[PDB]
């Protein structure tokens, strides 16, 4: 079967600038090379067919060239909405195969996270659980760290973290941190604190509440 | 237009036909020669009210939308007008879908009767591709 | 225009059959060649097979002849059956036409002996903009859908990928709205878990003292 190798694995580019994506075939595929765009697990969308032929509704700034074993997708004047996975696919030989994909990041201005903290709901306490949630929304770049503090004392255990892909509107990243405890663990202590460190921050952004209040 | 043999050979190679579905370039050049005599304007009207269009005599009942053909299916999702061009792009595209059915090049009666079994390589000799 | 929609179970027990329907609207099953493509959790895509106009099928040899692709002209549908599934068959499944212009939304299928568990949904209410949220805990399998005011509130929304801890998923959703709109206007998250056949609406209200 035919192996497609994509280079590089990643690109970060500033809007209005250009990138070149490479796809090399383990053997000659003639012109039988199609280019797809996908954002995470949303439906792929066909950009180019047969190496270089245009697709109605795809902008002119997308251009495919190459033949035999060597292919290139050119993206001129990148827009914010070009973020995501780029895949080449051969149809020279069944079974039809896909490259491993190139990941395209939009460059934008460093942005500080908006941090929000939420005590466990009444309803969760009622059921004998306590989840404390911190949102860190709309930051750039992607790297960030969150420390949980309980009466000035850090905690690793019971912390689960989740990150979005690059936003299609503003090219920022967001993150959720959830600290899960039992009701009994939760009610032993008073002060709960979410601490975000990011390359934009001149000191840790600190959000906290005390159980005793409203 | 009427293609030269080596001229059609080089265009079909550019359009990625060489060993598509395992069929050597010579097979494709032979199919065109006996189907249309290398003439992109060739048409043929069939008993069943379908018409065969272009260099590979692609039939309106399954593959393309004219506007006259009964039980008409347009599998290539194009009009038959496109299959009459001096630009073979649309004929090649449509032929790849046709051949990617289990019947292969048997889709071409003229291929089966005059090409299948013969020295199809002879059809690209002298073309240095 | 032509639209494709995958349907069927999102949970399959190991060694059993994964059955998916592709429903086609806006043209005939007879009008095209019809494919199945799947995507593994690590951004890896696999062409599974297609059925062409004569009924001839093409199956990826990687699938060890575990695969059947059939059609029903009268319902305007085609089908995937994949036999003897393992966890290596956990993936997002797409129907698409051979040309690749038409694609379904794709459906996540988990291969697991684990039982269907419905989610618990908790309001996340605060202690120029105000951020609210919904915590969605203790469910199996993926997926769940969150909307805010039934889809009308769409900007300001961050639905985070689910995280699996101990064979149960937890996901959270945030929404940012003007100070002026909440709590003076109602903000409700709508959580669907198809696998349990559960729809729950949770109004975000100010905390009691």
How close, in Å, is residue C74 to chain B by CA atoms? 16
Domain boundary among A71, A106, A141: A106
Residue C208 near residue C200 (C-beta atoms within 8 A)? no
Residue A132 near residue A120 (C-beta atoms within 8 A)? yes
Q: Which residue of B has its CA nearest to C102?
A: B77
Partners of B28 on chain A (C-beta within 8 Å) are none
Q: Nearest Cβ partner of B18 from A30, A50, A53?
A: A30
The H-assigned helical ranges of C44-156 are none
CB contact under 8 A, B20 and A92: yes
The reported resolution of this PDB entry, expressed in Å, is 2.2
How close, in Å, is residue B126 to chain C by CA atoms? 35
A and C: number of Cβ contacts within 8 A: 128
Residue B57 near residue B42 (C-beta atoms within 8 A)? yes
B101 is in an annotated binding site: yes
Nearest to B54, CA basis, from B86, B23, B25, B77: B86
Instruction: Give me the residue spans of the domains in chain B.
Output: 1-129
- Tell me yes or no: is domain C120-204 CATH 2.60.40.10: yes
CATH of the domain at A69: 2.60.40.10
CB contact under 8 A, C160 and A174: yes
Phi, psi of C30 (to 5 degrees): -70, -15
Q: How far is CA A156 from the centre of its chain?
A: 24
Q: Which residues are CB-contacts of C108 (< 8 A; sequence separation ≥ 6)? A: A41, C10, C91, C92, C93, C141, C142, C143
d(CA C142, CA C9): 11
Both A133 and A192 in a single domain?
yes
Q: Which residue of C has its CA nearest to B93?
A: C99
Both A79 and A120 in a single domain?
no
Q: Is B85 on the interface with A (CB under 8 A)?
A: no
Residue C81 near residue C19 (C-beta atoms within 8 A)? yes
Joined tokens for residue A193: 């604190």
d(CA C204, CA C202): 6
CB contact under 8 A, A118 and C108: no
Q: How many domains does chain A have?
A: 2
**Which residues, numbered 34 to 53 in chain B, qualify as contacts with chain A under a Cβ-Cβ cut-off of 8 Å?**
none
Both A97 and A118 in a single domain?
no
d(CA C132, CA A47): 38
Q: Is B75 on the interface with C (CB under 8 A)?
A: yes
How close, in Å, is residue A160 to chain C by CA atoms? 7
Domain boundary among A90, A106, A122: A106
Partners of C127 on chain A (C-beta within 8 Å) are 117-119, 209, 213-214
Both A92 and A118 in a single domain?
no
Number of other CB atoms surrounding residue B87 within 10 Å = 11
Torsion of CA A192, A198, A203, A206, to 10 degrees: -20
**Beta strand pairing call for C44-51 and C188-193:** unpaired
Residue C104 near residue C96 (C-beta atoms within 8 A)? yes
Catalytic residue annotation of B: 35, 52
Residue C191 near residue C162 (C-beta atoms within 8 A)? no
CB contact under 8 A, C53 and B102: no
CB contact under 8 A, C158 and A174: yes
Both A169 and A197 in a single domain?
yes
Nearest to C17, CA basis, from C82, C86, C90, C113: C82
Query: What is the residue range of A121's domain?
Result: 114-210
Both A11 and A100 in a single domain?
yes
Q: Is A91 on the interface with B (CB under 8 A)?
A: yes
Number of other CB atoms surrounding residue A72 within 10 Å = 18
CATH class, B1-129 region: mainly alpha
Q: Which of the other chains make 3 or more beta carbon contacts under 8 angstroms with chain A?
A: B, C
Both A59 and A125 in a single domain?
no
A and B: number of Cβ contacts within 8 A: 27
Provide the edge-to-edge strand list for the sheet that holds A19-25. Answer: A4-7, A19-25, A70-75, A62-67
Looking at domain C3-111, what is its CATH homologous superfamily? Immunoglobulins (2.60.40.10)
- Length in residues, chain A: 214
Q: Nearest Cβ partner of B73 from C30, C52, C58?
A: C30
A171: left (phi over 0), alpha (psi -120 to 50) or beta: left
d(CA A178, CA B43): 69
Phi, psi of A125 (to 5 degrees): -60, -50
Both A120 and A101 in a single domain?
no
**Technique behind this structure?**
X-ray
d(CA B17, CA C203): 61
Partners of A50 on chain B (C-beta within 8 Å) are 15-16, 93
How close, in Å, is residue C99 to chain B by CA atoms? 8
A49: left (phi over 0), alpha (psi -120 to 50) or beta: beta
Both A183 and A130 in a single domain?
yes
CB contact under 8 A, A31 and B14: yes
B51, containing H or E segment:
strand B51-53
């Amino acid at each position: 079967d035919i192996v497609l190798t994509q280079s590089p694995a990643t690109l970060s580019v500033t809007p209005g600038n250009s990138v070149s994506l490479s796809c090399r075939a383990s053997q000659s595929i003639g012109n039988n090379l199609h280019w797809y765009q996908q954002k995470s697990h949303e439906s792929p969308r066909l950009l180019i067919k047969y190496a270089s032929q245009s697709i109605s509704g795809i902008p002119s700034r997308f251009s495919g060239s190459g033949s035999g074993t060597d292919f290139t997708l050119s993206i001129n004047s990148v827009e914010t909405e070009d973020f995501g996975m780029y895949f080449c696919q051969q149809s020279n030989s069944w079974p039809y195969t896909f490259g491993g994909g190139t990941k395209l990041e939009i460059k934008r201005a460093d942005a500080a996270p908006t941090v929000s903290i939420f005590p466990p709901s009444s309803e969760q306490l009622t059921s004998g659980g306590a989840s404390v949630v911190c949102f860190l929304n709309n930051f750039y770049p992607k790297d960030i760290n969150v420390k949980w503090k309980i009466d000035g004392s850090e905690r690793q255990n019971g912390v689960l973290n989740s990150w979005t892909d690059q936003d299609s509107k503003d090219s920022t990243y967001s993150m959720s941190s959830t600290l899960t405890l039992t009701k009994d663990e939760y009610e032993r202590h008073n002060s709960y604190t979410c601490e975000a460190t990011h390359k934009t921050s001149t000191s840790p952004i600190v959000k906290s509440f005390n159980r005793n209040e409203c | 237009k009427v293609f030269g043999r080596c001229e059609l050979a080089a265009a079909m190679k550019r359009h990625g036909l060489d060993n598509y579905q395992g069929y050597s370039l010579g097979n494709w050049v032979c199919a065109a020669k006996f189907e249309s005599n290398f003439n992109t304007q060739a048409t043929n009207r069939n008993t069943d009210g379908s018409t065969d269009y272009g260099i590979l005599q692609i039939n309106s009942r399954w593959w393309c939308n004219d506007g006259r053909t009964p039980g008409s299916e347009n599998l290539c999702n194009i009009p038959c007008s496109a299959l009459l061009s001096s630009d073979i792009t649309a004929s090649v595209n449509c032929a790849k879908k046709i051949v990617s059915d289990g019947n292969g090049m048997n889709a071409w009666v003229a291929w089966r009767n005059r090409c299948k079994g013969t020295d199809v390589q002879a059809w690209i000799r002298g073309c240095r591709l | 225009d032509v639209q494709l929609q995958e349907s069927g179970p999102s949970l399959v027990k190991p060694s059993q059959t994964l059955s998916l329907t592709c429903s086609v609207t806006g043209d005939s099953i007879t009008s095209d060649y019809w494919s199945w493509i799947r995507k593994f959790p690590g951004n890896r895509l696999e062409y599974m097979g297609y059925v062409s106009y004569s009924g001839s099928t093409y199956y990826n040899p990687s699938l060890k002849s575990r695969i059947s692709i059939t059609r029903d002209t009268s319902k305007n549908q085609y089908y995937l059956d994949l036999n003897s599934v393992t966890t290596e068959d956990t993936a997002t499944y797409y129907c698409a036409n051979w040309d690749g212009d038409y694609w379904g939304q794709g459906t996540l299928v988990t291969v697991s002996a684990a039982k269907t568990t419905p989610p618990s949904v908790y309001p996340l209410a605060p202690g120029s903009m105000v951020t609210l949220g919904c915590l969605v805990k203790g469910y199996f399998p993926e997926p769940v859908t969150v909307t805010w005011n039934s889809g009308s509130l769409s900007s300001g929304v961050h639905t985070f990928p689910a995280v699996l801890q101990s064979d149960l998923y937890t996901l959270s959703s945030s929404v940012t709205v003007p100070s002026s709109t909440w709590p003076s206007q109602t903000v409700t998250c709508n959580v669907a878990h198809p696998a349990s056949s559960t729809k729950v609406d949770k109004k975000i209200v100010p905390r009691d003292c």
